[PDB]
RNA sequence: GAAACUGCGAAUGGCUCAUUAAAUCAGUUAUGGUUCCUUUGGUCGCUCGCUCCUCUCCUACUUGGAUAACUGUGGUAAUUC
RNA sequence: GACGACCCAUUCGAACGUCUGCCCUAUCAACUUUCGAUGGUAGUCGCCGUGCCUACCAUGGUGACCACGGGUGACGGGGAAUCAGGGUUCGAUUCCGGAGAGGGAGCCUGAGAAACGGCUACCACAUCCAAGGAAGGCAGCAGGCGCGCAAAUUACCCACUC
C-alpha cells in the first residue's frame, strides 16, 4: 500500500520514466512505530522469510551502562529532553535512536557506594548514619582495608557527573531502535558529548 | 579540528571511547583522542594526512565504513561545486562495424571525495573504485589523486 | 435459553451483532457461519442480528430448567448417550481408578446388534496409555544423548 | 512466469554432457537439490538407462531404487534422481560392481569401474575454513561434508582422503608445485598434468599453469583445479585416455589403424 | 476400510504480447549490503537453576480441554449457503 | 527405522548494485526543485544498501558528444530471409529473460504471491430471482458469436516424457 519503491522518482536529467511493474511485497512500508514512554505494549509483526520482528510501543525501561567503570544496570526512562532529528518529537515525547533522555540514576550509586566505598553528592550526612552507614562502615577484619585500598584513587569522579546525582537524574543516549528490536538500550553520556548537549539544551529551551 | 561540529548532533568516530582513568598531564597533553584508520589493500596506501588530521566522515574508506571491492577505474576532474563530492568524466571511443571509424562519447559520474584530499584542482587525474551505494548517484569513492599529464599545475622545477 | 435461529430468507443469527438489521461482515476461520474452502480465505457474507422480532422463521430454544410437568413428546422419551471415552485419563476420572490399577478392562463395550453372522462388541483404542514399547523409545532417546557426549 | 522457484528443466535447456537426444519429449530429469551443482551433476536415472541400459523407462528405475540395491557414497539412496557428481562412488553390491564418476578428456562422466577396495574412500577438495563456536574448527568441501577437527596445516585447495565408513579423514595431500592435478571445469576439461607454476593477482580470478607429459602447456582458472596425487603419481586409479587431449587428426589415425568397429 | 481432522502441493506448468526506448534485455561483474521452503553434511544434557509453595512424594509408567466425521432436529425461491 | 525442531554449512534460487551496448523525430533546445530536483547531517521504515521516506541545512544536477519532449502496426535476446566483398530487411511465434490475466486499487495465507483455477471494493459488462437476495471473468484445452483478405476436433489416452 504505502510503499518503499524505487521505480518512481526522476533520474538525473530531470527525465521521467513511464509506469513499469505493479507494486510488490518486498517493496513495502508499514507505518511508523511512534513509540512513547508509558506501560509496555508490544506487538509481534510477521516479516519476510519468517523471523518475527518486535515493535515496542510505550517502553519505560532500558538497559543503560556506565562503561567508564563497566557496570550496566536496568533503570527507568523518565522523559525526553533532546532529539537531534527534529524539535517536534520532543514535544510529543517520542522515543527513537540517538535521543537524550533522563533516568532514575539509582543502582549506579548503590554499585559505587559498595565497590568504591564512598557516597556521591548528598544533602546531609544525618540520613546516612542510622542506615546506609551499615554498608559503608564494615566489620571485616581483614578486608575492611585490604580490598578497598585498591579501589582508592580510581574514583575521582568528574565534576559534571557528581552534580547530576543530587538532582537524581542523568543524561543517557538511546543506542537502539525500539521499533525494530522491541527494547530500549543505550550508554550514558561522558566526556565531551556531555558538555555538548548541555549547551544545546540551554540554547534551545529556556 | 578544534571545531568540527556545526550540526544539531555530535560527531565522532565509532570504535573510540573516552576513559576517565588517571589525572595528571600538567597544562595539556593527550588530546583525549586516539585516531582510527585502516589499510585499504590492493597496493593503495593510506595518506599521512588522514592519520595526522581530524575530520569525521563515514563515507571515506580511510576512516569510515565502506569497502572497495570489485572494479577499479580512473577518470578526470571536470567540476567541483558540491560538498564532500565531485563530478568526473570518462572519455572513450565507440566503434561502428559498418564503417571503420570511431567516434567520441563521454559520460559523467559523481563520486565522493574524502576531506583528506584538499589539494584537488579542476583538471587533475583521479582514480576511483567500486563500492556499495552511498547516495542516489554515488557508488564510488576516490582511492588516489595524481597529476602526470600535459600542462602541469605548477612550473617545472620539482 | 434461546440459542439463536434463522431469519426469513435463511440468514442465520450470531452473537455480538446488536440490533436487527442485515449486515455484511467480514468472516474468516474461527467465526460463526463460515466454511473455508481454502486456507486464509475471507468472504463477506450477510447475517442478521441478535435482537428478536417477529421477522424470524424459527428459533431454537434449549431446555435448561425442567418444570413440574413432563411434556409428552420430549421429556418422557428417554434416549441414552452412545459413547464412552477413547482416552486413558477420562476412564481414570470416570470410574474413579487409582494411579495403580492398570486399566485394561474398564472400557465400554459397544454392541454390534446384528450382521447376519454374530454380534460383535466393539471398543475404541486407548491413547496415552504406557506400554513397554513406549518406554523403549524413551530409553533409546537417552542412550543417544550419552553416546553423543562420549 | 516466476514468482517462486522452478521445478522443471527441459531437454534443450539441459547440459550437453548428459548426452541427451531430441526425439523424446520436451522435459528432462532435472536433479533435485543436494551437495553438487547441476552443471556438474550426473543425475542417477541418466546412469541407469542412458549409459548402462539396465532400465528402459523411468518407471523401472522407481521399481529398482526401492529395493535398496543402490548406494551412493556408502549410504543408501532410494529416489529416481540424486545429484552425484565428480568424485563419488556408486556401489551395487548384488552385481559386485563399483563405479567412479570421473572425466574423460572429452569432458563427460565416463564408466570407470574399480575394485571394491578402492571404493571405500574418495578424494575431497577443501574450499573454506570456518572457526565454529568455542574454539572448534571446521572444513567445508565440494561434496558438502563438514568434518570437524582437521589437522592444523590443511588449507583450501588441498585435498583430503575421507573414509566413507567413519568420516574423519585419515590423510591428505598439500597443494604444492609439481603435484599432479585434474581439471573439473572450464574449456580444458579432463586433462591431467603437473602444476608447474602458479600465478597470483590481488583481486580475483588467479590462474594456474599446467603442463602434461606430452609436452604441452595450458592454463585454467584456480577454482577449476583439483589435486589427485603427488608428481606423476596419482593416489587414485585413472581411466584410459589419461589427459592426453589428442587432436582430431590423430584420433582419426587410431581408428583406421586398428580398424576397430567390430570384434 | 468410505468419511473427517492433520501434514504437503496448488507461487510449478500452460497462455498472450497489451504495457514497456538506458526501461526491458545481452555480455561482464558485486553482496565484505542481504533473504532462502527443500536436499545433503554437521549441531542435539543447566545451560547446574526444579528456583514451585501445597510446606514439601512432585503426572513423568506420559499432563490439560474441545471439534469434525457420526447420531438426531431444522431454515431459505436459490448457492461447494 | 519414521516424524518433528534450533543453529551453521550446502543446493535451488530470489533481490538490489557495477561497466559497455538502442529505432524514428529539432515544424521538440533548454530541462529538473519543496508537489525531492542534486548533495550533506540525523532519524524512521525495509530482508538489506539507498532521498525510499521525514526533519534540518546547502544549491546543485543535465544538455549540440542531442538532453528534455513527441512518435513507434517497439516486448528483449539466442536467431531468420537475401547476399561476391561491405550490407539490407525481419524477429507475435516451440529455448532463455520480462510483463499481464475485463479496467484500477487494496489485502489475506505462506519460505516464496501484491496471486486472479485466492479474497475485498470501485468502474465498465453480463446472469439468476418468489424481487427479500445470490452468483461470474476461456490472453488454459476444445467450442460459439463478432471482426475481418485471413486460420483445425465440444476426438482418444497417462503407455512414453516429466
Amino acid at each position: 500500500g504505502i510503499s518503499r519503491d524505487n521505480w518512481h522518482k526522476r533520474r538525473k536529467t530531470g527525465g521521467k520514466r513511464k509506469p513499469y511493474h505493479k507494486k510488490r511485497k518486498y517493496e513495502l512500508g508499514r507505518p511508523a512505530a511512534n513509540t512513547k514512554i508509558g506501560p509496555r505494549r508490544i506487538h509481534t509483526v510477521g516479516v519476510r522469510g519468517g523471523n518475527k520482528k518486535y515493535r515496542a510501543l510505550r517502553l519505560d525501561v532500558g538497559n543503560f551502562s556506565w562503561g567508564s567503570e563497566c557496570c550496566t544496570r536496568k533503570t527507568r526512562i523518565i522523559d525526553v529532553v533532546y532529539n537531534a532529528s527534529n524539535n517536534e518529537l520532543v514535544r510529543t515525547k517520542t522515543l527513537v535512536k540517538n535521543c537524550i533522555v533522563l533516568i532514575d540514576s539509582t543502582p549506579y550509586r548503590q554499585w559505587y557506594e559498595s565497590h568504591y566505598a564512598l557516597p556521591l553528592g548528598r544533602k546531609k550526612g544525618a540520613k546516612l548514619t542510622p542506615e546506609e552507614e551499615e554498608i559503608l562502615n564494615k566489620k571485616r577484619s581483614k578486608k575492611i582495608q585490604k580490598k578497598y585500598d585498591e579501589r582508592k584513587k580510581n574514583a575521582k569522579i568528574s565534576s559534571l557527573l557528581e552534580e547530576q546525582f543530587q538532582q537524581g537524574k542523568l543524561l543517557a543516549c538511546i543506542a537502539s531502535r525500539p521499533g525494530q528490536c522491541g527494547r530500549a538500550d543505550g550508554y550514558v553520556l561522558e566526556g565531551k558529548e556531555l558538555e555538548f548537549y548541555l549547551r544545546k539544551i540551554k540554547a534551545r529551551k529556556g | 579540528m578544534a571545531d568540527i561540529q556545526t550540526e544539531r548532533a555530535y560527531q565522532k568516530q565509532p570504535t573510540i571511547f573516552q576513559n576517565k582513568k588517571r589525572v595528571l598531564l600538567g597544562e595539556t597533553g593527550k588530546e583525549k583522542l586516539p585516531r582510527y584508520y585502516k589499510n585499504i589493500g590492493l597496493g593503495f596506501k593510506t595518506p599521512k594526512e588522514a592519520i595526522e588530521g581530524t575530520y569525521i566522515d563515514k563515507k571515506c574508506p580511510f576512516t569510515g565504513n565502506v569497502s572497495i571491492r570489485g572494479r577499479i577505474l580512473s577518470g578526470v576532474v571536470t567540476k567541483m561545486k558540491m560538498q564532500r563530492t565531485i563530478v568526473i568524466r570518462r572519455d572513450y571511443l565507440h566503434y561502428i562495424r559498418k564503417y571503420n571509424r570511431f567516434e567520441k562519447r563521454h559520460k559523467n559520474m559523481s563520486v565522493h571525495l574524502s576531506p583528506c584530499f584538499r589539494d584537488v584542482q579542476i583538471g587533475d587525474i583521479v582514480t576511483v573504485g567500486e563500492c556499495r551505494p552511498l547516495s542516489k548517484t554515488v557508488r564510488f569513492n576516490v582511492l588516489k589523486v595524481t597529476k602526470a599529464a600535459g600542462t602541469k599545475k605548477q612550473f617545472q622545477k620539482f | 435459553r434461546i440459542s439463536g435461529g434463522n431469519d426469513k430468507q435463511g440468514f442465520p443469527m450470531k452473537q455480538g451483532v446488536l440490533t436487527h438489521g442485515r449486515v455484511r461482515l467480514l468472516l474468516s476461520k474461527g467465526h460463526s457461519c463460515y466454511r473455508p474452502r481454502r486456507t486464509g480465505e475471507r468472504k463477506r457474507k450477510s447475517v442478521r442480528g441478535c435482537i428478536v422480532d417477529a421477522n424470524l422463521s424459527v428459533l431454537n430454544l434449549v431446555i435448561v430448567k425442567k418444570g413440574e410437568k413432563d411434556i409428552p413428546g420430549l421429556t418422557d422419551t428417554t434416549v441414552p448417550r452412545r459413547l464412552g471415552p477413547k482416552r486413558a485419563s477420562r476412564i481414570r476420572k470416570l470410574f474413579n481408578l487409582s494411579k495403580e490399577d492398570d486399566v485394561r478392562q474398564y472400557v465400554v463395550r459397544k454392541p454390534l446388534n446384528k450382521e447376519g453372522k454374530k454380534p460383535r462388541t466393539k471398543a475404541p483404542k486407548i491413547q496415552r496409555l504406557v506400554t513397554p514399547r513406549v518406554l523403549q523409545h524413551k530409553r533409546r532417546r537417552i542412550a543417544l544423548k550419552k553416546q553423543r557426549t562420549k | 512466469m516466476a514468482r517462486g522457484p522452478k521445478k522443471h528443466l527441459k531437454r534443450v535447456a539441459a547440459p550437453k554432457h548428459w548426452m541427451l537426444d531430441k526425439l523424446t519429449s520436451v522435459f528432462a530429469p532435472r536433479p533435485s537439490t543436494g551437495p553438487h551443482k547441476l552443471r556438474e551433476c550426473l543425475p542417477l536415472i541418466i546412469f541407469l538407462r542412458n549409459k548402462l541400459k539396465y532400465a528402459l523407462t523411468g518407471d523401472e528405475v522407481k521399481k529398482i531404487c526401492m529395493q535398496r540395491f543402490i548406494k551412493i557414497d556408502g549410504k543408501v539412496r532410494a529416489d529416481i534422481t540424486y545429484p552425484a557428481g565428480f568424485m563419488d562412488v556408486i556401489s551395487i553390491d548384488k552385481t559386485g560392481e563399483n563405479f567412479r564418476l570421473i572425466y574423460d578428456t572429452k569432458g563427460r562422466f565416463a564408466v570407470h569401474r574399480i575394485t571394491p577396495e578402492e571404493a571405500k574412500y574418495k578424494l575431497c577438495k577443501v574450499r573454506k575454513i570456518f572457526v565454529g563456536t568455542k574454539g572448534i574448527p571446521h572444513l567445508v568441501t565440494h561434496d558438502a561434508r563438514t568434518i570437524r577437527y582437521p589437522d592444523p596445516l590443511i588449507k583450501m585447495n588441498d585435498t583430503i582422503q575421507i573414509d566413507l565408513e567413519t568420516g574423519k579423514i585419515t590423510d591428505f595431500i598439500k597443494f604444492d608445485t609439481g603435484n599432479l592435478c585434474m581439471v573439473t571445469g572450464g574449456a580444458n576439461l579432463g586433462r591431467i598434468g603437473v602444476i608447474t607454476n602458479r600465478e597470483r593477482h590481488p583481486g580475483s580470478f588467479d590462474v594456474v599453469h599446467v603442463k602434461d607429459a606430452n609436452g604441452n602447456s595450458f592454463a585454467t582458472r584456480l577454482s577449476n583445479i583439483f589435486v589427485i596425487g603427488k608428481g606423476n603419481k596419482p593416489w587414485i586409479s585413472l581411466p584410459r585416455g589419461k589427459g592426453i587431449r589428442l587432436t582430431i587428426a590423430e584420433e582419426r589415425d587410431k581408428r583406421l589403424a586398428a580398424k576397430q568397429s567390430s570384434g
Side-chain angles (χ1 to χ4, degrees), chain D:
Chain D
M1 287 303 300
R3 282 176 282 171
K6 297 171 63 178
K7 307 178 185 179
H8 295 289
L9 184 62
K10 297 183 181 295
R11 198 151 294 271
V12 192
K16 186 62 178 181
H17 61 83
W18 299 348
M19 299 187 286
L20 301 181
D21 59 357
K22 293 188 289 296
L23 291 180
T24 53
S25 313
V26 296
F27 297 103
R30 188 178 177 89
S32 299
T33 50
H36 291 84
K37 297 166 65 179
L38 61 82
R39 298 295 181 169
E40 195 179 1
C41 288
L42 179 59
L44 182 59
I45 175 165
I46 306 183
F47 197 56
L48 300 176
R49 68 180 188 84
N50 301 110
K51 292 291 181 295
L52 297 173
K53 305 179 179 63
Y54 289 116
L56 294 172
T57 52
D59 191 53
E60 291 185 1
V61 178
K62 192 65 179 184
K63 293 184 288 286
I64 288 164
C65 296
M66 293 286 108
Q67 307 301 109
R68 312 301 184 84
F69 298 131
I70 279 62
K71 288 183 176 179
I72 303 180
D73 300 306
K75 297 183 181 297
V76 182
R77 302 298 178 196
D79 193 59
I80 305 179
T81 50
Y82 184 82
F86 183 66
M87 296 292 170
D88 294 308
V89 285
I90 302 174
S91 181
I92 307 300
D93 298 295
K94 185 172 179 61
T95 56
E97 289 176 354
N98 295 89
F99 299 101
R100 191 73 170 224
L101 295 172
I102 50 180
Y103 293 114
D104 294 304
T105 195
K106 296 296 183 182
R108 55 194 184 194
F109 292 111
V111 176
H112 179 241
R113 297 187 179 89
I114 45 173
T115 55
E117 182 55 53
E118 208 286 301
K120 292 176 65 179
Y121 58 95
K122 56 178 178 177
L123 194 53
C124 299
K125 202 176 70 176
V126 179
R127 300 192 300 171
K128 188 171 68 174
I129 312 170
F130 174 62
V131 188
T133 54
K134 304 185 179 181
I136 298 177
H138 295 287
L139 291 180
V140 179
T141 59
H142 64 90
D143 51 291
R145 289 182 184 274
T146 299
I147 303 299
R148 297 182 296 159
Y149 303 113
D151 300 0
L153 67 173
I154 303 178
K155 302 185 184 184
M156 65 294 291
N157 303 109
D158 292 1
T159 48
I160 60 190
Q161 291 76 249
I162 185 71
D163 290 359
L164 298 167
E165 297 76 58
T166 53
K168 301 297 182 180
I169 63 103
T170 305
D171 51 351
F172 60 104
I173 298 165
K174 179 64 182 66
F175 189 57
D176 297 296
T177 306
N179 289 346
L180 195 66
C181 62
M182 171 58 94
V183 188
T184 56
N188 293 289
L189 184 50
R191 304 191 67 171
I192 305 178
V194 292
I195 291 288
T196 310
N197 191 45
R198 294 179 293 244
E199 182 174 0
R200 300 293 293 181
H201 298 291
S204 54
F205 301 115
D206 299 3
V207 291
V208 171
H209 302 82
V210 188
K211 184 187 174 296
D212 58 6
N214 299 284
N216 296 295
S217 50
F218 56 103
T220 313
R221 293 182 173 177
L222 176 58
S223 300
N224 294 337
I225 303 300
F226 180 85
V227 186
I228 57 174
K230 300 297 185 181
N232 305 301
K233 288 182 71 62
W235 296 10
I236 52 173
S237 188
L238 292 181
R240 64 179 183 178
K242 302 180 184 297
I244 296 172
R245 195 64 176 267
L246 300 166
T247 191
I248 52 182
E250 292 176 355
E251 290 170 1
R252 184 181 61 198
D253 296 310
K254 295 191 299 179
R255 293 182 292 112
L256 59 84
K259 191 55 61 177
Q260 183 179 54
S261 292
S262 295

Side-chain angles (χ1 to χ4, degrees), chain B:
Chain B
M1 298 191 177
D3 186 63
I4 50 183
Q5 284 79 16
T6 187
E7 301 302 305
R8 299 185 293 113
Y10 192 76
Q11 297 297 308
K12 60 177 185 179
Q13 301 176 317
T15 65
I16 293 295
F17 185 58
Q18 286 71 49
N19 293 110
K20 297 293 181 64
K21 307 276 184 189
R22 171 76 223 113
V23 57
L24 228 81
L25 233 187
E27 251 324 293
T28 343
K30 301 320 85 206
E31 82 195 337
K32 333 193 311 284
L33 179 60
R35 188 62 177 176
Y36 182 67
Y37 61 98
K38 55 173 179 295
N39 57 350
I40 307 302
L42 198 56
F44 293 95
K45 295 177 65 178
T46 187
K48 193 190 182 195
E49 304 301 298
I51 311 178
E52 286 179 349
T54 303
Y55 50 85
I56 305 298
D57 190 7
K58 60 179 186 178
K59 294 185 174 293
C60 55
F62 300 107
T63 302
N65 295 108
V66 54
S67 297
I68 291 87
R69 50 105 177 97
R71 299 191 184 271
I72 301 291
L73 293 170
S74 197
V76 62
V77 180
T78 187
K79 184 188 294 181
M80 48 180 177
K81 203 69 181 66
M82 301 164 73
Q83 52 184 352
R84 299 185 176 178
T85 184
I86 54 176
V87 187
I88 54 172
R89 187 174 182 179
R90 290 176 57 80
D91 293 295
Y92 59 95
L93 293 173
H94 182 68
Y95 182 61
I96 304 293
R97 61 178 296 175
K98 177 179 169 61
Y99 302 102
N100 294 297
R101 289 85 173 113
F102 294 87
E103 53 183 4
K104 181 60 65 179
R105 290 184 180 177
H106 72 290
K107 296 188 181 183
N108 289 306
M109 299 188 304
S110 297
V111 49
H112 175 280
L113 182 64
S114 192
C116 187
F117 299 120
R118 294 296 298 167
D119 302 297
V120 293
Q121 299 181 26
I122 303 178
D124 284 297
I125 311 300
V126 62
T127 304
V128 292
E130 187 179 352
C131 303
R132 61 174 184 83
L134 285 309
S135 194
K136 186 177 173 60
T137 65
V138 179
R139 294 291 187 279
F140 294 162
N141 286 302
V142 173
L143 289 162
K144 183 174 175 63
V145 184
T146 189
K147 185 65 171 65
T151 314
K152 298 186 175 183
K153 300 299 190 177
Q154 45 75 58
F155 294 96
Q156 296 179 26
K157 50 173 65 61
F158 55 93

